[PDB]
Write a protein that binds this ligand. Structure first.
Ligand SMILES: N[C@@H](Cc1ccc(C(=O)c2ccccc2)cc1)C(=O)O
Ligand SMILES: N[C@@H](Cc1ccc(C(=O)c2ccccc2)cc1)C(=O)O
Lengths: 306, 306
């Protein structure tokens, strides 16, 4: 159905009941926000892919190019941030996402919007605010006041934009729980899993350089996956297995030499999971297959950006 | 001279050099802000008296009825706060202060003013911000985000108002130091001492009920001073001695029975300080004299409010 179609590959939906009530409505909107990023990676793609699922399910899509938030989170100057946001819009369009793209500053600095921010600041403890920025705040030995304004700003935007569904990675859940409590109208939160970095040490990040950009070249992709963390029989924290699960189409024909078993055909990721977990599928073979399928996947996108 | 006239009874002037440069200018402005208070006490009077000193010295006076700050500091709703601010203006006018009175919200919610607040939030650490609100923040077991917005708001207002001199109690110095660092144009800070409460346990405060309101009745004043902390020979932390120092005119004729030494005439507070410190002047006699002089002082003000 549509519900499960949307539920597929998500970490959680804050209230599947509320989401069912939403699917009944004729006009429904889903929204996601991104601090403009210099490089758009699989992490972003995973989420845009999810926005497309919702769109296919009749949701109007709202993409917030969060320039003010990025400004508050030390990403630089607004106009500079604004141009990177511009580029992101194109990469998002290149991914096949037809939607309403809006910057945050045009309305996030409005007289009333601000009074609402201060109203929320009166009900948001500093400890609660600091906690929600743990996975989002730019690393800083001397946390700025801006760090705690950021979360309440995100909450006021959810109010302003008035979407039925808000999508984001699991790292956004605390700011989302905060909004669930502070806001009068409860919005459904769809949380996407956070991909692991290629080296498997942490989560995939634009600043940690452990990602695969959607416009990376075929050679770059092959080289990135080749060096990627991928222990035989290990699925948890295996970035390569995550890519197979979140981006690959099945049945998947893992091509390999007869000398090693010959071409293998997997009808589902779960099946691939078994084969790899039971060490019947070798890392090098998993990689070559993921790398080639991924390249095909991203090609259309890279072509458009070029 | 004018300098010392302004320096009289102040705790500190952040840069007496800068203050001298200011006195040379033809047009100079001095400003002070108050979170609207239900009762205006000696603490406020001390500061308005100081604003008048500056006014007599050719300064244009700006009085900020800080409704937004009070809102941020949990004083209630803006309109309610706005009406108490209205009443304060009259009490201030009743004190003989002719000046420009402005609320903060009319300009503190402006698009650019807000972006400037966020700019400042990017250079103000949370620890630095928390520290400046130690003597100002409303008591709260769960510090709100609003607490740290307050200080940067005060700093942006100093920028906006563009006064040459900013006046306030010593409890405001950390927020003032913060402004000295963050702002491009350095404004002179004149800090007034903080009066001790009548019970001598803490500082005089509108919420601690240890103050003398300028419109208190003669009977109320007499009764408040009678019960006031005032150890014989002790000057430090003696609220009664502070009142004699900051509000009384000299020579001061301390009236008392011949049975106890008869009427005494002191030509200066310093002299009074000696007499009291050397236990030659009794607390009860100090009180009766301060109480009667204070009543005369405030009378004009109380009459006008009635
Ligand atoms: N916090 C996200 C960026 C972000 C997400 C969401 C928001 C919203 O307030 C929003 C957008 C769309 C719908 C509802 C709410 C602003 C900014 C990040 O770390 O990149
Ligand atoms: N913090 C003060 C109130 C306050 C003082 C000063 C200000 C200003 O920003 C200001 C006013 C006038 C001039 C310069 C600066 C705002 C609010 C209090 O505890 O009551």
């Amino acid at each position: 159905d549509e519900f499960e179609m949307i539920k597929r590959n998500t970490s959680e939906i804050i209230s599947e009941e509320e989401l069912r009530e939403v699917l009944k409505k004729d006009e429904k909107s889903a929204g996601i926000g991104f601090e403009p990023s210099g490089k758009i990676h699989l992490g972003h793609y995973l989420q845009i892919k999810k926005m497309i699922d919702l769109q296919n399910a009749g949701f109007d899509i709202i993409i917030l190019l969060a320039d003010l938030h990025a400004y508050l989170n030390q990403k630089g100057e607004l106009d500079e941030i604004r141009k990177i946001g511009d580029y992101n819009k194109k990469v998002f369009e290149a991914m096949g996402l037809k939607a309403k793209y809006v910057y945050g500053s045009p309305f996030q600095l409005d007289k009333d919007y601000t009074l609402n921010v201060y109203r929320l600041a009166l009900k948001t403890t500093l400890k609660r605010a600091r906690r929600s920025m743990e996975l989002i705040a730019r690393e800083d030995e001397n946390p700025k006041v801006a760090e705690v304004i950021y979360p309440i700003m995100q909450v006021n935007t959810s109010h302003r934009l008035g979407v039925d569904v808000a999508v984001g990675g699991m790292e956004q859940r605390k700011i989302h729980m905060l909004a669930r409590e502070l806001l009068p109208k409860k919005v459904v939160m769809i949380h996407n899993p956070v991909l692991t970095g290629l080296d498997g040490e942490g989560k995939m990040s634009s600043s940690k350089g452990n990602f695969i950009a959607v416009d990376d070249s075929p050679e770059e992709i092959r080289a990135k996956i080749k060096k990627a963390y991928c222990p035989a029989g290990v699925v948890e924290g295996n970035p390569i297995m995550e890519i197979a699960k979140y981006f690959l189409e099945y049945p998947l024909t893992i091509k390999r030499p007869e000398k090693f078993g010959g071409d293998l055909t997997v009808n589902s990721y779960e099946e691939l999971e078994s084969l790899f977990k039971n060490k019947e599928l070798h890392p090098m073979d998993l990689k070559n297959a993921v790398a080639e399928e991924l390249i095909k996947i991203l090609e259309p996108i890279r072509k458009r950006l070029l």
